[PDB]
Amino acid sequence: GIDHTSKQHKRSGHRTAPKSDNVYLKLLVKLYTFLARRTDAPFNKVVLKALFLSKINRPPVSVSRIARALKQEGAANKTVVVVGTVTDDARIFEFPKTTVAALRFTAGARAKIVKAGGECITLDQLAVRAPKGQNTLILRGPRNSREAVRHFGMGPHKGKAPRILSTGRKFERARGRRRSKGFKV
Amino acid sequence: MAHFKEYQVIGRRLPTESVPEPKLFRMRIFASNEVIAKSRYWYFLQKLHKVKKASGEIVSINQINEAHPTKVKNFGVWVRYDSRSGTHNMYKEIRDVSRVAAVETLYQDMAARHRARFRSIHILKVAEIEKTADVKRQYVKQFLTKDLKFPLPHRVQKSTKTFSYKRPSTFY
Amino acid sequence: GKSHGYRSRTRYMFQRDFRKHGAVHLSTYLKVYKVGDIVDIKANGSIQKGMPHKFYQGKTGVVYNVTKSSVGVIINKMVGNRYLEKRLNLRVEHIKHSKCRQEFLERVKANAAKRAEAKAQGVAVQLKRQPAQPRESRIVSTEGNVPQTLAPVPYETFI
Amino acid sequence: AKSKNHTAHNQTRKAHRNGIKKPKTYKYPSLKGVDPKFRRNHKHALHGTAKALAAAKK
RNA sequence: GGUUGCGGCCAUAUCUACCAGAAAGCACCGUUUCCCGUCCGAUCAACUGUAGUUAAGCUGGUAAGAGCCUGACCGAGUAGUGUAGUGGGUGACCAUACGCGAAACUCAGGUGCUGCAAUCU
RNA sequence: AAGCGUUCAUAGCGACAUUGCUUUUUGAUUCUUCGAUGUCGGCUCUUCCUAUCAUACCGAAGCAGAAUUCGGUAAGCGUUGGAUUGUUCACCCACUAAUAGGGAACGUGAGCUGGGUUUAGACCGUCGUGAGACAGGUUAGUUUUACCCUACUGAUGAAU
RNA sequence: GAAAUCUCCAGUAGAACAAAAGGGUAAAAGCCCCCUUGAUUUUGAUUUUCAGUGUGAAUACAAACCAUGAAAGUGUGGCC
RNA sequence: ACUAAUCGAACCAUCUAGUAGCUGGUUCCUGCCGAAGUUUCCCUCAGGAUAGCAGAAGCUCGUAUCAGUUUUAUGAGGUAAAGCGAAUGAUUAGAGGUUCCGGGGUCACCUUGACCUAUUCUCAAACUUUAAAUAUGUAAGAAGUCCUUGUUACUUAAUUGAACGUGGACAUUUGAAUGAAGAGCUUUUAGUGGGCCAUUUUUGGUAAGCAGAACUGGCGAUGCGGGAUGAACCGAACGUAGAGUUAAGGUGCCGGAAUACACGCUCAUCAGACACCACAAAAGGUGUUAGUUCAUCUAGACAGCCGGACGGUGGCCAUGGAAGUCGGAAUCCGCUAAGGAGUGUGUAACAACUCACCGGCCGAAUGAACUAGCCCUGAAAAUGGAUGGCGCUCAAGCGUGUUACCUAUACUCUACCGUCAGGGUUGAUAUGAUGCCCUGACGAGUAGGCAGGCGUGGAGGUCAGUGACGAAGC
RNA sequence: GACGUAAGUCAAGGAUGCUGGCAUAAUGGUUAUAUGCCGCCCGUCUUGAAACACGGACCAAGGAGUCUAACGUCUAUGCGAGUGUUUGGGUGUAAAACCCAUACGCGUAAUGAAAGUGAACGUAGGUUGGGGCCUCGCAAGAGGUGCACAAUCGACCGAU
RNA sequence: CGUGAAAUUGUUGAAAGGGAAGGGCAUUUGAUCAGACAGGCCAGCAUCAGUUUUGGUGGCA
Ligand SMILES: [Mg+2]
Ligand SMILES: [Mg+2]
Ligand SMILES: [Mg+2]
Ligand SMILES: [Mg+2]
Ligand SMILES: [Mg+2]
Ligand SMILES: [Mg+2]
Ligand SMILES: [Mg+2]
Ligand SMILES: [Mg+2]
Ligand SMILES: [Mg+2]
Ligand SMILES: [Mg+2]
Ligand SMILES: [Mg+2]
Ligand SMILES: [Mg+2]
Ligand SMILES: [Mg+2]
Ligand SMILES: [Mg+2]
Ligand SMILES: [Mg+2]
Ligand SMILES: [Mg+2]
Ligand SMILES: [Mg+2]
Ligand SMILES: [Mg+2]
Ligand SMILES: [Mg+2]
Ligand SMILES: [Mg+2]
Ligand SMILES: [Mg+2]
Ligand SMILES: [Mg+2]
Ligand SMILES: [Mg+2]
Ligand SMILES: [Mg+2]
Ligand SMILES: [Mg+2]
Ligand SMILES: [Mg+2]
Ligand SMILES: [Mg+2]
Ligand SMILES: [Mg+2]
Ligand SMILES: [Mg+2]
Ligand SMILES: [Mg+2]
Ligand SMILES: [Mg+2]
Ligand SMILES: [Mg+2]
Ligand SMILES: [Mg+2]
Ligand SMILES: [Mg+2]
Ligand SMILES: [Mg+2]
Ligand SMILES: [Mg+2]
Ligand SMILES: [Mg+2]
Ligand SMILES: [Mg+2]
Ligand SMILES: [Mg+2]
Ligand SMILES: [Mg+2]
Ligand SMILES: [Mg+2]
Ligand SMILES: [Mg+2]
Ligand SMILES: [Mg+2]
Ligand SMILES: [Mg+2]
Ligand SMILES: [Mg+2]
Ligand SMILES: [Mg+2]
């Protein structure tokens, strides 16, 4: 017998592969597995782990988010890398001429980047031209901005959204939510 | 609690700034080994002085061998022991060749005749009596008679074999 | 039935010390507290306002708020399987500086003094404290100290 | 039909299998419960020093 | 070093009895017009430091003093207590091993120290 | 062992205290049984225990004899017939050597009986407005099955 | 008079503080006198019970308006 | 009561698969993880919600904010103990002083009650001047330390402070030990919300295999070796095997392993061979053993049973009669190496038998009160029976000591299976990259969760699959 | 790594060498039996089941978490500030497949009971961290930039 | 009257049977049965490596 200090036979709790059965994503994982192992560049290990993520773990990255990151000092000429979907954003009116490598582009995002003078490439093209991720800038979309995150941590005084179907008056704006009706939160 | 040895254990309190070089007390301890010897020394030093193993030290451990191991002596052992209902002092008189063998005999004797374990025995003193007729017990005085002789009737002979063909004798 | 009032089971906790009743001396009122100070909580039974609950008797916390005649203290309280941050408003009569912070604040001062002295020469001057070490070997003499001690004493009735 | 009333048996074993956690301190704690007069002035103090570095570092 | 004012710790400072105290200060003391308060200038208020007294207050000393304070290989590593045994004992309980460890008791010593300002043969 | 016992604590007793045993009392518990172990008593029959009533042999006495009392070995052998009561318990008559105490699922209901409790009928007293209540009285009230296995009592029987 | 009013000495609280008990309090938290309404307005924060929900009770504030006092200060009901 | 074998509301059909917090059942395998009977609330107590325990999905990072542990430093507490010539409240006993309602007693009182003063015996869960042990809070640094000066409507008499800052300096001994198995964080949901047992603390109760708490360890949920037997005790927790070594317990035989060695104790006409545990007490015993204290004895001590049983004396009263022995009273020495107003047995009573006290005979140790080991008495229940059984007596019993030996699914080594983790592997990896391979660790499990697979009916595709030369079934 | 001057050898990152018999029931497997030791009847409720708790005489077949509306979390897929062809219409090899307009649902705006109002002082802010990237470095590191995310102080919108 | 299971039964054959029977580990005996000659089966010895056990003897403190 052994006085076990930790739980035995514990899985790491991290994805070692994508749950997706997309054959082309498996080829991207196959390419970046080799790069993460045959290079010491930390960029390849980050990209390989990002290729495993689920859909909510890779939120879309706006072209406006891409353009704001290119306003950083000394970042005006870097290859923006988005392991996920790059969406369009009409609220911006000045996009720069830069190169974006992404897993997926929307039709509007591809049009806006190309029209500005830039170029849209895939992750395998990124690997050929930047094997160690030279002059790259990984961008991640907002993960806690999901609508399900609103209801996480519900409870008194927590200030979270209740899980509700119909909103308005007569739907949870009474006893428990105001001092004139019993108590508040 | 094996074949006993006698130990010359000297210990003292830890010296302080106010009173360095303490009085450096010594005891004679019967114990199976030095680990028990130090433990017994601290135990008896708890009965006498305001000290303990944490606030003191042992400066010397020395085995004491019999000066004349192969001459038969009469020993007077004072002992204080706890019975089931009280503490008693008694005096035993032992005839053997060493203090360790006499003390071993008394531990066997007190366990056999009084059910007093080594746990509840305090060896007050082991002192050889130099002269005959200063001995007080008849069970040892009877062996100090002139030209002592005695037989051993009914000799029991051990047989390696499980069967014997002779129906043997107990002559001696 | 059962009674679980605010000051229940505090018959001896909130007693004053023997021959130490009466008015609180002025030292407690002249001590200056600041945010970040580490303070010990010990309620004064003579002062019934700003008085801590019986749980925080003997607890040590950090000052987060300084007020007119009171001090806000942060205490971590174990509820269930985790600790919870707690915030008390206590008058200065019920708190005092925990002296543990002052020796540590002198050790850091003495550490910097030793390091500054060691800067010019003599590196590795053992800034860290060490536990009590096993004693080194030494010689003990018997000049005036010849060992002499008796055996265990016999059992006397003493009554 | 009488039953057990109360026992803290197994309650410390249960509380320790997930390893009782300290409250995860941070730099810059919440100013909740701090004196409003100090807090009102600290808003004006932080605004001025933010302008001081802005005027100098630029 | 005495004394005064404001203090810190709050009897080593308290309490009882008896003695000393130059100088200064403090004090008792003298007075009732005004401000003020009373049954009562006793207290409280004001006025003159003048008519006086260290008698008291105050301060210090004296006491195999009470109390208090400090320390002790004084009691005592005792009572107690954490841990251990397929230890003892019918049991009540007890012993041992590895640790921690008192109170009363008995002795010895001591009887305020000190901060800021002012003042004094 | 303070006293009683004419004197004498212990022949026989025995205060004030105190140590036990038993599980035939009654309490206390709720572990088993609520897809049910037939809930009182008696009759019948066997066996067991000893804390022995008688009987055998003894020891002690405030044992002269007779009769008694105390104690030992001892459960081998016996311990009854009746009035009243459903009774267990009790009480009385009488005989006797003696009318001792208990256990065995408070032995024993596919052994019986069914007086009692304890369904449904009915009456009384008290209580309740009432329906009804009462370990209060009173009367009437279905007692099933073995042909299996074991056990027991008897009866055959292969193989040597 | 053991005692009805007056006087002095001792008195560490052996009294009193609405109501149980515990704690606390002596130029007071008790007694008497004077003034008074902070037992008021507007919110958040905190403690106990606790799920860190509610209710009750309480704590320190902030922004007002007041009470009292020479003043510092105290006061957001009852010494806790 | 009866109303078609149906009656305290018939029968038939439908609503109706009426509801059920209640009972029963709930169907393949393997792998990994793995509980709770507890918090709060509820017309709640056989239920549910809530928090906790558990699984799964993971996410952000990569050795840290850390820890069912210690040390150092600094707090807190009022239980164990202790105390009552310290407070409160109980409590025993006298002393000394004193004065009033207290004592008949001056008309100032040996033979008094309170009260005071100094002592004395004993106590407290709801007493306390003290006061542990165990447990418990905090701190031991880069979110740190120091220097200089910037903001503010706060604050100060006043940049005096407060808080947050600019700039500069400090480094692996960066500010104790040990460890760290990755660390932190989130979502979601199962089961559970009857508990019970053991040590220690502890309440009610005479007690209980009783009822109720605290901490911990267990059983439940768990097999294995041992306690014959047993949920909980001891030991040790479990993939499939081999070898070795052991734990607890044992080694006469059943039964593996010494009828081993050593010192003693015990003889039971109810021996003993009981950790939990399956019982025995007070009180006793010239049974036997060991010991404590006191006294006597070689100048011949205790006993053995040899001699003397003395003056007043037949001691006073009285007993029908008491003379050494009915009682009251007595107990003086005339004394001797030595004989009492006699230790007893006695007579009407004496008398007489016989002794403490003393020797012409001895010869070595003796006497008393006790202490505790074993054994014995105390010690009585019912079918025949249980140190487990047989049996065991310088033990095969009891106490103690020393070795050797036996064997658990435990430990060590190796193999094989699986799981987890960390890695390697692309210029033909000499084509399986969810593949091949290297390295290390790990494996119990109810309720429950997840994963990988097996099997059945039918459906799309494929094998131009099988088959009257035999399909399916059995 | 060892020995040896070296070649080379070795017990140095896991067994080789030599020899015999048989080549079949010989070893082995399966099965019946015997022997040694062990092994209580499953399921269930339960703190506790072999239980003197309950269901089960046997066998075959049938036999119990399904479907639907709405929804939470997570995952996969398409598109993405949009998304959803299938109410319908067109078409068809005809319940299939293919094509499509306008609406509508949800989302892109909140807040208040409501009347209403309605989201940039700033490089969409400041501070502390933060993977990755860039520059200088043999490296350790230093500096710059710092998405997601965590804490905090602000700013804006609605209510008061 | 397709096939034609099981429970249960008859006959035949085989086996075992002192108050159940059934089962687990291992082997004996009886029965029955699969594959391999271009190494298959069971063994013996020597020299080694790994893990152990049991001795003999040497030199030191
Ligand atoms: Mg209370
Ligand atoms: Mg108040
Ligand atoms: Mg319950
Ligand atoms: Mg005057
Ligand atoms: Mg019960
Ligand atoms: Mg029946
Ligand atoms: Mg008898
Ligand atoms: Mg019966
Ligand atoms: Mg019957
Ligand atoms: Mg019947
Ligand atoms: Mg009847
Ligand atoms: Mg029959
Ligand atoms: Mg019959
Ligand atoms: Mg009807
Ligand atoms: Mg149904
Ligand atoms: Mg129905
Ligand atoms: Mg596990
Ligand atoms: Mg979990
Ligand atoms: Mg207490
Ligand atoms: Mg006590
Ligand atoms: Mg107490
Ligand atoms: Mg339940
Ligand atoms: Mg259960
Ligand atoms: Mg047993
Ligand atoms: Mg067992
Ligand atoms: Mg143990
Ligand atoms: Mg065992
Ligand atoms: Mg044998
Ligand atoms: Mg045996
Ligand atoms: Mg498992
Ligand atoms: Mg079908
Ligand atoms: Mg066929
Ligand atoms: Mg068996
Ligand atoms: Mg049930
Ligand atoms: Mg039950
Ligand atoms: Mg069962
Ligand atoms: Mg049932
Ligand atoms: Mg049945
Ligand atoms: Mg059936
Ligand atoms: Mg079927
Ligand atoms: Mg279609
Ligand atoms: Mg809608
Ligand atoms: Mg047919
Ligand atoms: Mg058949
Ligand atoms: Mg068998
Ligand atoms: Mg065979």
UniProtKB/Swiss-Prot annotation, chain A:
Entry keyword set: Cytoplasm, Isopeptide bond, Methylation, Ribonucleoprotein, Ribosomal protein, Ubl conjugation
One BP annotation, GO: cytoplasmic translation
Main location: cytoplasm
Pfam families the record matches: Ribosomal_L18
Parts forming coiled coils: none
Gene Ontology molecular function terms on file: RNA binding; structural constituent of ribosome
Family matches, as InterPro entries: Ribosomal_eL18 (IPR000039), Ribosomal_eL18/eL18-A/B/_CS (IPR021132), Ribosomal_uL15/eL18 (IPR021131), Ribosomal_uL15/eL18_sf (IPR036227)
Residues with N6,N6,N6-trimethyllysine modification: 49
Family to which this protein belongs: Belongs to the eukaryotic ribosomal protein eL18 family.
Function: Component of the ribosome, a large ribonucleoprotein complex responsible for the synthesis of proteins in the cell. The small ribosomal subunit (SSU) binds messenger RNAs (mRNAs) and translates the encoded message by selecting cognate aminoacyl-transfer RNA (tRNA) molecules. The large subunit (LSU) contains the ribosomal catalytic site termed the peptidyl transferase center (PTC), which catalyzes the formation of peptide bonds, thereby polymerizing the amino acids delivered by tRNAs into a polypeptide chain.
This protein's name: Large ribosomal subunit protein eL18A
From Swiss-Prot, chain C:
Location of this chain's protein in the cell: Cytoplasm
Protein keywords: Cytoplasm, Isopeptide bond, Ribonucleoprotein, Ribosomal protein, Ubl conjugation
Entry keyword Cytoplasm: yes
Top-rank taxon, per record: Eukaryota
Record Gene3D superfamilies: 6.10.250.3260, Ribosomal protein L21 (2.30.30.70)
Subunit structure: Component of the large ribosomal subunit (LSU). Mature yeast ribosomes consist of a small (40S) and a large (60S) subunit. The 40S small subunit contains 1 molecule of ribosomal RNA (18S rRNA) and 33 different proteins (encoded by 57 genes). The large 60S subunit contains 3 rRNA molecules (25S, 5.8S and 5S rRNA) and 46 different proteins (encoded by 81 genes).
Additional information: There are 2 genes for eL21 in yeast.
Known function: Component of the ribosome, a large ribonucleoprotein complex responsible for the synthesis of proteins in the cell. The small ribosomal subunit (SSU) binds messenger RNAs (mRNAs) and translates the encoded message by selecting cognate aminoacyl-transfer RNA (tRNA) molecules. The large subunit (LSU) contains the ribosomal catalytic site termed the peptidyl transferase center (PTC), which catalyzes the formation of peptide bonds, thereby polymerizing the amino acids delivered by tRNAs into a polypeptide chain.
Record PANTHER family: 60S RIBOSOMAL PROTEIN L21
Protein name: Large ribosomal subunit protein eL21A
UniProt source species: Saccharomyces cerevisiae (strain ATCC 204508 / S288c)
Taxon lineage: Eukaryota, Fungi, Dikarya, Ascomycota, Saccharomycotina
Gene: RPL21A
